[PDB]
Amino acid sequence: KFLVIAGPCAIESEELLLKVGEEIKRLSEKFKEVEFVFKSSFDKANRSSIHSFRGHGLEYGVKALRKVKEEFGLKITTDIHESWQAEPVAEVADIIQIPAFLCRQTDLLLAAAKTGRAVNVKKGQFLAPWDTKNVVEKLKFGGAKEIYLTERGTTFGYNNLVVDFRSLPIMKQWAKVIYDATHSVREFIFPLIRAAVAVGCDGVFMETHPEPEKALSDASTQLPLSQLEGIIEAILEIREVASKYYETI
Amino acid sequence: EKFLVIAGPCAIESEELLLKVGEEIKRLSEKFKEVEFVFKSSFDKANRSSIHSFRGHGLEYGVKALRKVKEEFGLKITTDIHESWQAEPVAEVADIIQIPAFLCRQTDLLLAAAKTGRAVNVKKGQFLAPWDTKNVVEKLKFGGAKEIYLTERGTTFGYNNLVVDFRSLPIMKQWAKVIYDATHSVMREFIFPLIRAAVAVGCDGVFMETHPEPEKALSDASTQLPLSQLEGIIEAILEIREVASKYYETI
Amino acid sequence: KFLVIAGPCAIESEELLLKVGEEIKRLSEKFKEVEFVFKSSFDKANRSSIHSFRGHGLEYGVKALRKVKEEFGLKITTDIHESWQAEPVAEVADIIQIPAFLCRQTDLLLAAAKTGRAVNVKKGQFLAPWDTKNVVEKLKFGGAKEIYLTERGTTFGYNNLVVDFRSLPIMKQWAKVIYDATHSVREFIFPLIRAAVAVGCDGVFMETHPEPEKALSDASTQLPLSQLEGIIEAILEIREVASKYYETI
Amino acid sequence: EKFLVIAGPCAIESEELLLKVGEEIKRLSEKFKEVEFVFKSSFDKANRSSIHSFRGHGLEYGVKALRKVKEEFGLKITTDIHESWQAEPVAEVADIIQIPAFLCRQTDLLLAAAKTGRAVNVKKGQFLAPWDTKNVVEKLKFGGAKEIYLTERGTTFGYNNLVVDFRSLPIMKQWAKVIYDATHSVMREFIFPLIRAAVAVGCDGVFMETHPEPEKALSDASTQLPLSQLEGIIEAILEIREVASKYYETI
């Protein structure tokens, strides 16, 4: 079924995760045809500035994420940044997320595959679509069977990313495809998520937060919690009509 | 507002070819009555890469052939001009004058088109940013143009490659009606999916080159859409447009 | 010999052209090993805004340009924008310049070739280096024998141009190569002109003006007249040393 | 200031290969005494595209082989790390710790390198803008790094292509010493010309992968420079640098 991975950018506090987990739990009961996965990072390991918020650590993060899975019965996903983190994170995470800049680190992919969990690799802004084939092959070699490739934009000049939707059908030849609606661009988020489902993908990825203008990360992009339902309904309707034309394989 | 579908053979290879495509377009116009069709074809491919490539049979022949289509099917006409002097003669038949991508900044060509009183459709250059089309429209209004279209046809992305930045659709929509060129922005395997993306995002129309037998065409044999496939593609985009339409954001 | 095409962006007045022609005349007598060509446009036919300065017309321009060639004995060059202009312009211009956006207009290239003069085609920001081969072939077919291709940057994201110096040796396979130092980028003008001669080119193209901050065009890029000599001396010295390593053909 | 030349085989295929290249580099260091040479080679290619490609013989073997070079030729050493834990062991031999292009933003890796006290050279990611390296250097200084280098290795330009925007050299020079990677920025036919451009613009050093027989290398067989060609290339850039040096602008 269609996948909808959502949640706040960083684990600002397990309190915040519960508030968002509750709303995601509700949509979950409302859209039985969609599979929801709660997402949040225990650490922003690649911020541009050294003076930026990173998080409360791996343990506190895994802890809070457990609280969401236990209190709401939602599948979980977070990202790892170094091999060793794969095992402790697999304890709670149903899907292990590989950061875009790290989509080429062989040991990181192998470590994620070894846990037995599903793996979702954000496509590097530097990677060509056809070059994701070798990414998948690495993970398969590592024992991974449930593999996702996520579209998040490509380097277009300086400080700018463009979404080449030709990548969805191309990457689909070797793995399920997810579209990152918030990192690929706030005014262009919805327009582009509509294009993604019109083209065809196996799921969408959205960072959401109660009050984005106060979130300690991606405050200019995180989708306002209240708007999630309406966007999910919108893409399910477009998908229903457009799926009729999705090209085979 | 009525969705626009601009389609036809890339080049006016012959008045016969034109009459064959026009016949189908006329049939589809009768079927898809909520669509406003415009028959398109160039009397000259003035910018081919090789000096040895097909160009056309002259402005005279082309305009006469287009006049035949309009006359025989009552279809609106559009064709592109390359130099200022061609605006006047072309305006005698074309309902919409098209400005080529590479020429979107040539002030005199735009002004020549605008004074004819006919509608003008400017293809966004592969070198231009979305927000820089504002001045393009301004030149047109300055020159008397009342009906203006901007067509998205891809952007330079490295060498020999064009990417479509769909954020351009809502940006350009701020100052003009927006058309999506499904055939030049891509190879044929991506025409359909990207056209689906265009209508989901939201545009005022699509532009498609179509030919009875693309493999024999004198230009764009690799990208022209087989005429038999036109109907289905049109039905699909109308379907996707409708279901996505309630979510189109206000400019 | 090495070519140095210089002059003010637009023909603001024949007075301005004489002032610049005088200085170019002087450098001309000082650098006998270099061939100088006076450049200036009679019309800025492709400005972004309709409310921008375009010029004083073709006749007034051809007139003034004649005054420079007669009063200083300098070769002349200006650009055309439509076929018909080729003949009247050839009267004075030793080299006919084709605008970058127009490097693909077959009739414009043929019209320029027909006059018998030399032709210099600015490489479109949208063109790949290897694709200039067909540009040259068009001109040869048109009867042109002295052909130049000019590097002026390539589209790099939005509102930005990058200079891929790999184009110089590539384009050199079929035509002499000129480097446009002022349109390819003011702080980066000199650094890049140095790279161009280090790599190898047949000449440089520079827009210069007495008081750039008052020029009715490219006021943020035009090189200050007073600085021309020092830059010419600099590139001749680098060339002298670097030419030893220029690859054959 | 002394020009830097960082060169060596891409991968530590064997301690023998290393000793063979080191011998030549030592010879050139004796000749070009105004140059500061640094022997480079990776103990692991942790980011190859294919799982079936050569990676290395382990950190243990690599560090021991590099220690051999320094020991036998008195040459400075540099190698790249991939995870935080490798900084400590690697710092026991490397005079300069290299940060891979794809990892230039991984805060912990940079901090790990900086605390060792060794110099750090960060390869500018193909996704990074020149001006965004300011924060890279800031992280390093924050972490205790006193000697910092930024290496230009090309920028993403469409798919499967990298362009070198030489304006980056003076921009990055504002906050750190700048090195030009002649071999990864390009294929071999453009190595020489672009390296000439780098020194004319102005940089503090060059980085070149070199191998006795590139066609047999276990990595970058297409771009590694034949060892026999190293001397001439170095002489040329020193010549071009000198004549262009008086025109280098002040930061």
UniProtKB/Swiss-Prot annotation, chains A, C:
Please name the InterPro entries in this protein's record. Aldolase_TIM, DAHP1/KDSA, KDO8P_synthase
Gene Ontology cellular component annotations, sorted alphabetically:
cytosol
The listed locations are: Cytoplasm
| Name of the molecule in the record | 2-dehydro-3-deoxyphosphooctonate aldolase
- Superkingdom classification of source: Bacteria
Question: Which NCBIfam families does UniProt cross-reference here?
Answer: KDO8P_synth, PRK05198.1
Subunit annotation: Oligomer.
The enzyme's E.C. designation: 2.5.1.55
The scientific name of the source species is Aquifex aeolicus (strain VF5)
A single GO BP: keto-3-deoxy-D-manno-octulosonic acid biosynthetic process
Give the keywords, sorted.
Cytoplasm, Lipopolysaccharide biosynthesis, Transferase
Please give the pathway this protein is involved in: Carbohydrate biosynthesis; 3-deoxy-D-manno-octulosonate biosynthesis; 3-deoxy-D-manno-octulosonate from D-ribulose 5-phosphate: step 2/3; Bacterial outer membrane biogenesis; lipopolysaccharide biosynthesis
What Gene3D superfamilies does the record point to? Aldolase class I (3.20.20.70)
Q: Which GO terms describe its molecular function?
A: 3-deoxy-8-phosphooctulonate synthase activity
Record-stated family? Belongs to the KdsA family.
Which chemical reaction does it catalyze?
D-arabinose 5-phosphate + phosphoenolpyruvate + H2O = 3-deoxy-alpha-D-manno-2-octulosonate-8-phosphate + phosphate
